[PDB]
Amino acid sequence: IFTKEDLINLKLYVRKGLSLPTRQDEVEAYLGYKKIDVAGLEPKDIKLLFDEIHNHALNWNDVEQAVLQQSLDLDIAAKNIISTGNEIINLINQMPITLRVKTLLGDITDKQLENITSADHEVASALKDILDDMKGDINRHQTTTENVRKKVSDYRITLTGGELSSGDKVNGLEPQVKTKYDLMEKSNMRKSIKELDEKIKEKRQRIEQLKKDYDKFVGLSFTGAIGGIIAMAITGGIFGAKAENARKEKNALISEVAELESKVSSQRALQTALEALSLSFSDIGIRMVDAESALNHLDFMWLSVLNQITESQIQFAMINNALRLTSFVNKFQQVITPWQSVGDSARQLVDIFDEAIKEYKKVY
């Protein structure tokens, strides 16, 4: 069944949804960016989803109050139907069995109300009235319970996705959070960043490799001084050239590295924002999945309760003037039996609300 943790998880999801920023500049401050250049993750995209979550959270208390008040109402409705049904059965069973088996319900109602006057006329009229009132009462509880179930179902489908009772189809807030979360992961830079770090270190070692070979070749260029004048011309030309090839290649890589470190710095910036947004969407999504499970329980409970009321209503429709009174008592028992289940479930739900409210004090 729907438990107190289920109700607390709904309140926790609503509180998270209402705390989401919805103003565009606040969503941007929350994201840490004005543009990310990933489809579906731009601040306008995130705001649209936060607006939908916020509106859904705003709508919980209408459902919550309908659920709790309907449980309070069905509690005392079940109690009244069972006790009044039992009183009616007891009244009938005061008739001797030799008469009960052959007397029809119409004999103790309609056939007393067609002629002219009686005490049995008044009680027979009151018996006909209380049956009519109970029939209408059970129809009313079916109608209101169907509406509560519809509110819970629509609240659930808004979270899961699907077709609402209005016929509108909605994508589902939880699958939408999941899509964006998946886009953040398809967009991750961690491997790109690591391969760029690797190339900065490697070119930052080669820049140093022939700073030493520049110092070598320029030393080598002087080793014509052994011969003197034209041995220095040939050592100067050959090794002076190899020394500049090393310097030129060096200056291409110092420019290369400054670019690559600017690039990797921006890729790290994107990753940091992705990781932050991922964590927020994970928190939202966990709150949603717990709320969804809570609503699965609540929806199933209200479908089951509605089914019991409908069972009672169908049995009540079988009561008619031509039932022998022994058959009537058996059918009236079949009318009130489903209401034990309805009342037990309704009282259980009221008590879960009570225990969920008390949980705050027990924790703090």
Residue numbers in the entry: 44 to 160, 163 to 409
Provide passages from the article that reported this PDB entry:
We have unraveled structures of the soluble components and the pore assembly of the YaxAB cytolysin from Y. enterocolitica. Together, our biochemical data support a role for YaxA as the initial membrane-interacting subunit of the toxin, able to bring the lytic effector YaxB to the target cell surface. Therefore, we propose that this class of toxins defines a new structural family of α-PFTs.
Strikingly, a deletion mutant of most of this domain (Δ265–284; Fig. 6c, lane 11) did not co-sediment with membranes. Uncharacteristic of PFTs, YaxA’s transmembrane moiety is fully solvent exposed in its monomeric state and becomes an integral part of the pore structure upon oligomerization with YaxB.
